[PDB]
Design a protein around this ligand. Structure first.
Ligand SMILES: Nc1ncnc2c1ncn2[C@@H]1O[C@H](COP(=O)(O)O)[C@@H](O)[C@H]1O
Ligand SMILES: [Zn+2]
Length: 180
DNA sequence: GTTCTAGAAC
DNA sequence: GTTCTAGAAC
């Protein structure tokens, strides 16, 4: 198939789709995640094209902080009264091109959350905190990740609230109901 | 990244 | 027999 039509380039299409945009300014766009892994799941993307965190440098530090601030604003404007806990961050190894900040509520109540990679990508070291990425770019000038990130996706399923071990995705999803 | 589904796990 | 996971996708 074509490069532009490849599944890994899909965000470059969605970020220009008015029906998926919930916020726009002169630097970034916020879209709904096409396959949300919780009740609230947005992606903050800059207009300018940066393939991944591998291409981030100190020239992008202001942009990374602005993305962080816009994510917090969206949380207030769209889920302020819910008082849900939120996390913001990046996957240590992304699948989709174009740098994007995850903004996801911590219910993880979604039919799109279906497999172990989904869970561990948001609930292990694989999920890089936005603040940690920002500080790493500021102090070290680039984003580096340790070896072994793919193995983290294979870890046993463990609740993020009470750390209880669960034997399967369905049993995990049922357990998460208890923390609503 | 998602779908689809073969067969492993239960 | 059904649930559940995990690899191909030309
Ligand atoms: N076409 C798409 N439009 C919008 N979001 C998408 C699309 N395809 C995948 N996603 C989401 O983008 C994220 C990609 O994850 P990652 O590449 O690991 O940061 C996931 O949350 C997906 O659900
Ligand atoms: Zn729990």
């Amino acid at each position: 198939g074509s490069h532009m039509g490849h599944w890994s380039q899909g965000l470059k299409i969605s970020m220009q789709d008015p029906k998926m945009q919930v916020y726009k300014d002169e630097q970034v766009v916020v879209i709904k995640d096409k396959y949300p892994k919780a009740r609230y799941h947005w992606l903050v993307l800059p207009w300018t094209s940066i393939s991944s965190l591998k291409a981030v440098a100190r020239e992008h530090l202001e942009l990374l902080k602005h993305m962080h601030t816009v994510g917090e604003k969206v949380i207030v404007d769209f889920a302020g009264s819910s008082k849900l806990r939120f996390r913001m961050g990046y996957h240590a190894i992304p699948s989709m091109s174009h740098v994007h900040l995850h903004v996801i509520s911590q219910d993880f109540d979604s039919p799109c959350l279906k497999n172990k990679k989904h869970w561990n990508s948001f609930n292990t070291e694989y999920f890089l905190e936005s603040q940690a990425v920002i500080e790493m770019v500021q102090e070290a000038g680039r984003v580096t990740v340790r070896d072994g990130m793919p193995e983290l996706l294979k870890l046993p399923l463990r609740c993020h609230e009470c750390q209880q071990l669960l034997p399967s995705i369905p049993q995990l999803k049922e357990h998460l109901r208890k923390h609503w």
